[PDB]
Design a protein around this motif. Structure first.
Motif, PDB file in Angstrom:
ATOM      1  N   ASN A 122       0.827  -1.201   0.000  1.00 38.00           N
ATOM      2  CA  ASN A 122       0.000   0.000   0.000  1.00 38.00           C
ATOM      3  C   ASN A 122       0.865   1.256   0.000  1.00 38.00           C
ATOM      4  O   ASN A 122       0.516   2.264  -0.618  1.00 38.00           O
ATOM      5  N   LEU A 123       1.995   1.191   0.697  1.00 39.47           N
ATOM      6  CA  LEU A 123       2.910   2.323   0.777  1.00 39.47           C
ATOM      7  C   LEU A 123       3.328   2.785  -0.615  1.00 39.47           C
ATOM      8  O   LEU A 123       3.311   3.979  -0.915  1.00 39.47           O
ATOM      9  N   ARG A 124       3.702   1.832  -1.463  1.00 41.96           N
ATOM     10  CA  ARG A 124       4.122   2.141  -2.824  1.00 41.96           C
ATOM     11  C   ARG A 124       2.960   2.703  -3.637  1.00 41.96           C
ATOM     12  O   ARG A 124       3.074   3.767  -4.248  1.00 41.96           O
ATOM     13  N   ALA A 125       1.844   1.983  -3.643  1.00 38.08           N
ATOM     14  CA  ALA A 125       0.662   2.410  -4.379  1.00 38.08           C
ATOM     15  C   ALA A 125       0.262   3.831  -3.999  1.00 38.08           C
ATOM     16  O   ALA A 125      -0.070   4.644  -4.861  1.00 38.08           O
ATOM     17  N   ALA A 126       0.296   4.123  -2.704  1.00 36.73           N
ATOM     18  CA  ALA A 126      -0.062   5.448  -2.210  1.00 36.73           C
ATOM     19  C   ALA A 126       0.725   6.535  -2.933  1.00 36.73           C
ATOM     20  O   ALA A 126       0.215   7.631  -3.170  1.00 36.73           O
ATOM     21  N   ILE A 127       1.970   6.225  -3.281  1.00 34.11           N
ATOM     22  CA  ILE A 127       2.827   7.176  -3.978  1.00 34.11           C
ATOM     23  C   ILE A 127       2.433   7.298  -5.447  1.00 34.11           C
ATOM     24  O   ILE A 127       2.533   8.370  -6.040  1.00 34.11           O
ATOM     25  N   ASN A 128       1.983   6.189  -6.026  1.00 26.80           N
ATOM     26  CA  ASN A 128       1.573   6.171  -7.426  1.00 26.80           C
ATOM     27  C   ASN A 128       0.334   7.036  -7.641  1.00 26.80           C
ATOM     28  O   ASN A 128       0.143   7.609  -8.714  1.00 26.80           O
ATOM     29  N   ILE A 129      -0.504   7.125  -6.613  1.00 31.25           N
ATOM     30  CA  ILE A 129      -1.722   7.921  -6.689  1.00 31.25           C
ATOM     31  C   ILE A 129      -1.463   9.364  -6.267  1.00 31.25           C
ATOM     32  O   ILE A 129      -0.663   9.627  -5.370  1.00 31.25           O
ATOM     33  N   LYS A 130      -2.148  10.297  -6.921  1.00 29.40           N
ATOM     34  CA  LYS A 130      -1.996  11.714  -6.615  1.00 29.40           C
ATOM     35  C   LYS A 130      -3.266  12.273  -5.979  1.00 29.40           C
ATOM     36  O   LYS A 130      -4.355  12.162  -6.544  1.00 29.40           O
ATOM     37  N   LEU A 131      -3.119  12.873  -4.804  1.00 33.13           N
ATOM     38  CA  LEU A 131      -4.254  13.451  -4.092  1.00 33.13           C
ATOM     39  C   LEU A 131      -5.001  14.445  -4.975  1.00 33.13           C
ATOM     40  O   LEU A 131      -4.424  15.039  -5.887  1.00 33.13           O
ATOM     41  N   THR A 132      -6.289  14.625  -4.698  1.00 34.64           N
ATOM     42  CA  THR A 132      -7.114  15.549  -5.466  1.00 34.64           C
ATOM     43  C   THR A 132      -7.743  16.604  -4.562  1.00 34.64           C
ATOM     44  O   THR A 132      -8.667  16.312  -3.804  1.00 34.64           O
ATOM     45  N   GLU A 133      -7.238  17.831  -4.652  1.00 36.47           N
ATOM     46  CA  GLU A 133      -7.752  18.928  -3.841  1.00 36.47           C
ATOM     47  C   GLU A 133      -8.002  20.165  -4.699  1.00 36.47           C
ATOM     48  O   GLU A 133      -7.162  20.550  -5.512  1.00 36.47           O
ATOM     49  N   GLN A 134      -9.164  20.783  -4.510  1.00 45.78           N
ATOM     50  CA  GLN A 134      -9.527  21.976  -5.267  1.00 45.78           C
ATOM     51  C   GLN A 134     -10.230  22.994  -4.375  1.00 45.78           C
ATOM     52  O   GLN A 134     -11.300  22.723  -3.832  1.00 45.78           O
ATOM     53  N   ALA A 135      -9.619  24.165  -4.228  1.00 41.80           N
ATOM     54  CA  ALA A 135     -10.187  25.225  -3.404  1.00 41.80           C
ATOM     55  C   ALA A 135      -9.909  26.598  -4.005  1.00 41.80           C
ATOM     56  O   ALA A 135      -8.760  27.037  -4.071  1.00 41.80           O
ATOM     57  N   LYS A 136     -10.966  27.272  -4.443  1.00 46.12           N
ATOM     58  CA  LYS A 136     -10.836  28.597  -5.040  1.00 46.12           C
ATOM     59  C   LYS A 136     -12.063  29.451  -4.741  1.00 46.12           C
ATOM     60  O   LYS A 136     -13.162  28.930  -4.544  1.00 46.12           O
ATOM     61  N   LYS A 137     -11.871  30.765  -4.710  1.00 41.40           N
ATOM     62  CA  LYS A 137     -12.963  31.693  -4.439  1.00 41.40           C
ATOM     63  C   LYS A 137     -13.253  32.565  -5.657  1.00 41.40           C
ATOM     64  O   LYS A 137     -12.340  33.136  -6.255  1.00 41.40           O
TER      65      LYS A 137
END
Length: 163
Positions: free
Chosen positions: A148-163
């Motif tokens: 899971n440690l490796r896979a976690a790195i392969n995946i990129k978090l998704t965050e979106q915050a704008k006004k």
């Protein structure tokens, strides 16, 4: 006068560094050590003979500047013993972002939230980063952790915050 590019130079010194406590230093050197070294990457870990006349508070964030990736272990003894040494981390915010693909979160042991003081924004913040890895009690599950440690790195978090 505008300084050219040749004047400015930058280079890497280490591939990644781990941040743990002497309490769980054995497990880190008996699990993480053999887990990273296996790849043959420059792992910057604690070492005797510290640079005199150098603030550690800055080293915490500097480790990421000198290294390619930052590895930290979420353990109780960390905030229980190194509550101060880590407290400094709070002041540091630019140290890293949320959508960073160069960070490895490893939950060596559980931590009581009720004990987490309101002032502790860095710690309590974990509430959002709870999506980290957890150290399995069984030996057969150990294989899943690294997986899971490796896979976690392969995946990129998704965050979106704008006004």
């Amino acid at each position: 006068s505008n300084i050219p590019l040749e004047e400015l130079q930058r280079n890497l010194q280490f591939h990644a560094f781990i941040s743990y406590s002497g309490h769980d230093s054995f497990w880190v050197k008996n699990e993480l050590l053999p887990n990273l070294e296996k790849e043959g990457m420059q792992i910057c870990l604690h070492e005797r003979n510290f640079v005199p006349g150098k603030s550690i508070v800055e080293n915490i964030i500097t480790c990421i500047e000198k290294s390619y990736k930052s590895i930290f272990v979420l353990s109780p003894n960390f905030v229980q013993s190194e509550w101060c040494h880590y407290e400094l981390y709070f002041a540091h915010h630019n140290l890293f972002h949320e959508g960073s693909n160069s960070l490895i979160l490893i939950l060596l042991e559980p931590i009581p939230q009720y004990s987490i003081p309101s002032s502790y924004h860095k710690l309590k913040s974990l509430m959002a980063r709870r999506t980290y890895l957890e150290w399995p009690k069984e030996k057969s599950k150990r294989g899943l952790f690294w997986a899971n440690l490796r896979a976690a790195i392969n995946i990129k978090l998704t965050e979106q915050a704008k006004k």
